[PDB]
Amino acid sequence: MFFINILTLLVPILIAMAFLTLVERKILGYMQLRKGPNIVGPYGILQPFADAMKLFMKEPMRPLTTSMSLFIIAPTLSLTLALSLWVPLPMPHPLINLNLGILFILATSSLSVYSILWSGWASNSKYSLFGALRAVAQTISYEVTMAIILLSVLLMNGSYSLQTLITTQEHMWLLLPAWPMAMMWFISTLAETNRAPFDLTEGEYAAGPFALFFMAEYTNIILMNALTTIIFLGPLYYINLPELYSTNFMMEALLLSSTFLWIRASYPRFRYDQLMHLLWKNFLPLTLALCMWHISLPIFTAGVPPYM
Amino acid sequence: RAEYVVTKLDDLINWARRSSLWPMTFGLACCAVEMMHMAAPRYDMDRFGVVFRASPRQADVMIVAGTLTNKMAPALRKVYDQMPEPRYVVSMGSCANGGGYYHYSYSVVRGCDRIVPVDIYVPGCPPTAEALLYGILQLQRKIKREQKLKIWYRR
Amino acid sequence: ELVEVLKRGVQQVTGHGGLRGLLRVFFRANDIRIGTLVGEDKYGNKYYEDNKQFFGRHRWVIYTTEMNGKNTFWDVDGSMVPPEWHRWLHCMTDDPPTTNPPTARKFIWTNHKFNVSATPEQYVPYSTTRKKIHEWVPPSTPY
Amino acid sequence: MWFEILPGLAIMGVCLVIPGVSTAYIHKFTNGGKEKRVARVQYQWYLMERDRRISGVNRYYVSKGLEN
Amino acid sequence: MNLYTVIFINILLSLTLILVAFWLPFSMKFFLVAITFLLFDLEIALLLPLPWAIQTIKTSTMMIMAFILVTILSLGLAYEWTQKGLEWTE
Amino acid sequence: TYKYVNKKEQESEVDMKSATDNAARILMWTELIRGLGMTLSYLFREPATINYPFEKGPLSPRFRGEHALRRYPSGEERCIACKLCEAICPAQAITIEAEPRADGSRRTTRYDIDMTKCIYCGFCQEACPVDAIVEGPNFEFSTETHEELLYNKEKLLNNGDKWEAEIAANIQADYLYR
Amino acid sequence: NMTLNFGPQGVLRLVLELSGEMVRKCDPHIGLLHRGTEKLIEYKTYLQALPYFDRLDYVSMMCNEQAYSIAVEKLLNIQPPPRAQWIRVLFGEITRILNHIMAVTTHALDIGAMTPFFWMFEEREKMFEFYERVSGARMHAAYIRPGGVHQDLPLGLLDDIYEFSKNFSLRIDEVEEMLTNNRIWRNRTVDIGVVTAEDALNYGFSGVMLRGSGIQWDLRKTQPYDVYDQVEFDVPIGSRGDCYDRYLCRVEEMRQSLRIIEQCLNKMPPGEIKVDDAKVSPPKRAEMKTSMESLIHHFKLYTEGYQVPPGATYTAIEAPKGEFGVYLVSDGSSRPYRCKIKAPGFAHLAGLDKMSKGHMLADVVAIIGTQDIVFGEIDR
């Protein structure tokens, strides 16, 4: 039964990424006063399969000055992490019920720098290494707030578990409080996923590797929006209606993933220096201040949460 | 017979390769504003599956748009070589078809067909985005009319 | 005003030859609009009109499934449109052949040919001018 | 018009709803019509092992009650 | 056993995809950034146990120590700022 | 007469009201939600796209596309081999060679155009004193070889016979402007 | 020094010498689009050469035909009539709008904001429709010729242009909402590529690159050439000489173009369209086919065109990118002896290196966009 559960978890998220590609294209088109894909299949639902076939049918021109080891284990690692992140997620009951689950998320997210850096060091150049260093620095820098935000918001629920946030928001979202922490969390998800306006790394791989990188990217997108939904937009949980919880979670995650593309179409890009100034001069001060605020709140209020 | 399933396999491969055409837009001159107008809403390049502009390292088709000079030919050839097989080329305009209004000049290549092999020639100075789209669909059909697996089987 | 939209939609769906015609249309021309049939040409193509759509979509055409021995159920070209309908479809006119017919002249093609860029009946160039310099030919008997 | 992105939005929504209800149903099936008991500390693990030992069929979810 | 199974499955799937792929046919600024990230990640390490520390009785002490941590971290940040360590204008 | 862009008529006020307004603009991300709203509005409009092979873009009776060699109602050709087209063609794309025909007339033996040299300027049909060579309406004549675009008297006469039912009408439309 | 070659793989080749992330040396490379227009023109009549100007600076093409027309008319010592002058002004302003759409939107595209491109190239299509309705070609309309204009306007064109001018303003506002006050746009543009007025002058700049630094120089309010002296419009000047000021200048220019088009439409006069001097401009076809002299003139004009008394000129046009000039030398022949084209992008690229001082790699791509660099007018 467990292998069946694993299949039910993995297959749909991959399908959902493959179709999130199409949703992005169509939304950007309609925002640009055009349609997008209409032909290959009814409304385009065959275009992702077409593209997958095309890529995987191309011929890989593997750079000659390179290392096959780091050439193969970079996208393998990326996809492995992007899939193993979806495991602990309570939807509402999790495939693997972990304590310290958000910490597992932090770590398995921070482990992608290794691939995004080995790819560059493998490609024998200096421009690719420059780009890789810069992207690594960006991702690293934003991991700091990605961590502190949770460190401060996990004091309204005294546990690092994801199955406690359901009862923590059994009456009210964690957005009304910490809406300044969300606005800083919703963005570090863009910069972490190198998503516009933070795409200074994609604005040098064969068909298969490029496809794996694409899959990892969009999977991480869906997952970050799912974390937002679970944490700051706690859906409904009636003990007998996991169906209800899952429906609401899906709706909110789709809202968020469409907001990402809304933004991509709406705004220009950033400049690496200004992108780093943003964090190190606007997000870290406010983050530390609100961290102290949220360490004091449960004290000068008698609302310090429990450890079950 | 194996012939039936091999025909169907080739048909599927060609469907994918023709429905996921990604262009490298080697745009040199006034035969590129028309490609832009073709990506624009009224023609929506992206509606058939042809992305607006991708990287020259993961592209399938290559649109040569405008006058190719003797100072620019080596870079175009290097791009063609870097591109991954199976790769196709489309020559958009008189300049790239035969040199056009500068055919008798000292700094012009009298046809991109001397630097790279071409599959579809689009005539005009400039050819409307409608004509460029017609040419790209002609390329789609040229792809749909391939028999790779058949020739490898009856070899 | 939403139920009226749904009604317009269901009539747009059922406005064809049932499910078979609906699938035919939706899969050849990714569109299920309903319009007025102004005419039909010798080659089996149909030309529809609707003046409430915007400029560029107020006229359109459904091509034939066969043209001069060719399965055009999927393959389709704007080169199939003969001239008289080409001129009304690219909006050079407000009047189609049915009302404004062309000038009946011989030496005009009765059967239209589409693009032949690679078919065996394509165009091969050559020189139309005869030989200029005629050589000398000696007799077939010696001395 | 804008109502042509739904063919994909709904596909993704169904694919994102499947995991949750699938896991819930499979839990209810593998654990005797009840949720999968969680063990955040050793006390709950002890209770679970004890239920398993008193079951007589080596399964923690076979509740016995007063009859025994 | 279950975590092991899931991660093994993911690794197998990735390697299978990447096999099919082939079988079908100096500036000190970045260093300073890395160092600052170290000095903040270790602070995260010292800051993570607050959900267990705020369950204690010595609240007047946890308040104090957490405030000390955050304050001196902010001061170090401000100094790295004043000394032009967050500029990028070579 | 001139104007100023990015210049204020006078200094502003540092009042708490305006300072708080600017601080709200900064923190609450106000000037960006309006761009989000513009994109949403555009999402909720009708796109300008058209099915190409079924819906065609609009043109005019003056469009300069593919070439054609015309005839008279009798069926006789019109080109009298006067070479004005060859003499005005900027790209030197027209090659002509004429002779006296057995019926004693000025007619061509050779009339070649190179579509890889034509810039599609119309000067040839501006010069033709008989309306024999015309840059017709067609634009969908792409090929796969560079040798199908070297036209000749035969190809051009076939194109004329093909498209005369349209060329004649467009000329009837526009000939009063020229 | 971390040197690199950037731009190709769309004919630009920058050679950049950096220092970390800063930019120390920018060496542009030229001649990737050099065809030999100025030499080919020497083997072609004064009419066989016009298309070359439509092909130079290919986003306007008519403010290009116009300069050549004015130069040849200055030599011939003729002048076209009022209706031709008004049509020519109207369409020059339309080309201005096209060019400024192009500039702003490709700027925002190379920066990252891409939706204006698609929102505005539809309007560009609608104006190519005018181009075609009047000339038969969407872009390269060999429509403005020495002596006036080839053909008159069809009977349903001014109404369409009015319907278009009605709404182009709301479209500009749609774009301004997204771009002008966006903090990210302002950060990408403000204080970038600053340049002072005296250095601009000494570097040879023209147009927005002049009047974004406080200078007051427009070759339509000064040195006017067409009936522009009969129409009103403002010239927007800047205060700091940065990309933001130039953006605002181009926008307000797109607005003054509508202000001029309203007047051109309302004041369109009747009459002929080309000088009735059949030794310069051909006669009509009925007169050609009924009158001997008209037919002789047609023959001579389309075989051995009009002869131009010797001399030299430099006729400057306030093109959307600045002063477009033509040093045209004439012998008493049907063909010219020399035609040198003055393009602003030339000096603008020349000054790119100084304008990219104390800036990163991602600001150079905006410094370029602020010049509207088209390489046809440059490489020629």
Ligand SMILES: CCCCCCCCCCCCCCCCCC(=O)OC[C@H](COP(=O)(O)OCCN)OC(=O)CCCCCCCCCCCCCCCCC
């Ligand atoms: C060639 C390509 C190479 C690429 C490979 C990339 C693989 C990386 C995949 C991501 C890494 C995931 C890291 C796993 C850490 C697990 C942390 C965790 O929370 O597990 C703890 C688990 C539960 O304990 P707890 O939550 O504290 O309380 C339970 C009481 N009810 O209690 C347990 O301890 C469970 C038992 C531990 C299971 C961990 C196994 C992790 C997967 C192993 C990967 C092996 C890969 C091959 C070898 C790697 C190289 C040597």
Ligand SMILES: CCCCCCCCCCCCCCCCCC(=O)OC[C@H](COP(=O)(O)OCCN)OC(=O)CCCCCCCCCCCCCCCCC
């Ligand atoms: C009890 C009383 C006291 C309690 C204590 C708390 C009181 C409230 C404190 C106020 C909190 C303010 C909100 C916190 C975040 C603010 C961050 C911020 O302001 O960023 C500043 C930065 C611009 O800074 P700067 O360049 O200097 O401005 C231009 C100068 N003219 O701005 C930026 O660069 C941001 C870049 C944004 C780019 C992407 C924008 C996308 C927006 C999409 C919508 C997101 C909406 C949120 C989604 C929620 C997710 C569920």
Ligand code: SF4
């Ligand atoms: S063919 Fe004409 S429009 Fe195309 S690039 Fe050459 S000159 Fe420009």
Ligand code: SF4
């Ligand atoms: S339209 Fe073509 S063939 Fe005719 S004169 Fe112009 S360039 Fe020559």
Ligand code: SF4
């Ligand atoms: S101008 Fe007309 S009649 Fe004279 S040679 Fe050319 S096509 Fe023939």
